[PDB]
Amino acid sequence: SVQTAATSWGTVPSIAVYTANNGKITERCWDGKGWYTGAFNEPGDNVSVTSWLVGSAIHIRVYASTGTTTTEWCWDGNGWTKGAYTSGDQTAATSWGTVPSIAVYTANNGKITERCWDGKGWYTGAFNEPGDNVSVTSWLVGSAIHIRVYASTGTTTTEWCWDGNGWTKGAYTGDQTAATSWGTVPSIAVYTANNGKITERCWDGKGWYTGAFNEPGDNVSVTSWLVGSAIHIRVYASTGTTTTEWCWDGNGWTKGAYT
Ligand SMILES: CCN(CC)c1ccc2c(c1)Oc1cc(N(CC)CC)ccc1C2c1ccccc1C(=O)OCCOCCOCCn1cc(CO[C@@H]2O[C@@H](C)[C@@H](O)[C@@H](O)[C@@H]2O)nn1
């Protein structure tokens, strides 16, 4: 089945969804007025994405992997350009602040490792754990980053936590996952594709529970945004070459307009 990655920004919001299909990654875009085809078109069997705003200006980083080679592509308002990133493998990316800092996790032959950017060159991070699949989400509390990495082997997903004092195993209870988070509590939703079905586990600070989302798919991606205190979630569920968007806007899961 095709494999997707999603990011979003602002409160409209804008959404970009990257799809890897038969070794090519293409882009579909939403800015409030209909889906359209974006400019990005590069080779890849696997894709991940992160983005950040500086004022009103979006910066996008797309990580495109063939075999064991990952290429970073950069959008900074003036066309796509190849980025400095160095380390098919499967990646997950997150970013924070306006520098920004970036962490890119790679699953390669049953091991996940980490490459980091803080504005002064790529380096190897401390994270090194078993896994065939990886997803990540992060949030800031002031200047302090918190990272959650979901590492899966077979049907077992292990959560790994960075909270400024080393990687520790988290309370979360191969399958493929996607994760998003919001606020400073925070809330976290983790989607898992297992045997053609996507299910949802949720944290709001008081234990993991099963969420309401339950839809068909072999691959999943997710993005979310706040409008005030209200969370909005978009889950992209793929079977074969068909991707279905599922929308949570506080009143149940509804199918979205994505094509
Ligand atoms: C922090 C807020 N923004 C948003 C507009 C910003 C500001 C300045 C630049 C920015 C962005 O981006 C670049 C990008 C390049 N490129 C094109 C992508 C080279 C490939 C070159 C310069 C800037 C400069 C630049 C302009 C003038 C003066 C300063 C600096 C400077 O960043 O630095 C402040 C700290 O000391 C100077 C370091 O600047 C050179 C080293 N470098 C590369 C990058 C950008 O690299 C890319 O983006 C990353 C976030 C990673 O994804 C990389 O792998 C990727 O290659 N930022 N700094």
Ligand SMILES: CCN(CC)c1ccc2c(c1)Oc1cc(N(CC)CC)ccc1C2c1ccccc1C(=O)OCCOCCOCCn1cc(CO[C@@H]2O[C@@H](C)[C@@H](O)[C@@H](O)[C@@H]2O)nn1
């Ligand atoms: C007896 C258990 N309770 C009662 C709820 C408790 C325990 C610690 C604090 C508690 C409460 O409350 C506060 C309140 C504040 N304030 C008041 C000014 C502002 C919010 C500040 C600090 C505390 C702390 C505190 C004191 C010292 C050191 C740390 C922490 C800390 O926040 O959490 C540390 C984590 O373990 C103990 C916390 O117990 C609550 C249950 N739990 C687990 C997690 C974190 O779990 C991980 O991160 C998640 C986001 C998920 O990824 C998890 O799967 C993962 O395991 N947070 N709460």
Ligand SMILES: CCN(CC)c1ccc2c(c1)Oc1cc(N(CC)CC)ccc1C2c1ccccc1C(=O)OCCOCCOCCn1cc(CO[C@@H]2O[C@@H](C)[C@@H](O)[C@@H](O)[C@@H]2O)nn1
């Ligand atoms: C011409 C009359 N028709 C049908 C022929 C109509 C009218 C209103 C809606 C319609 C359809 O459909 C939906 C569908 C959704 N879903 C599934 C039920 C996903 C959330 C949600 C809303 C509608 C609304 C709706 C309800 C409440 C608020 C707004 C909107 C809204 O869309 O606009 C109607 C008035 O114009 C406001 C400007 O927006 C027009 C087009 N539009 C769609 C959206 C929301 O679209 C969704 O969220 C996005 C961020 C993307 O993820 C989408 O792909 C997703 O469909 N915002 N604007």
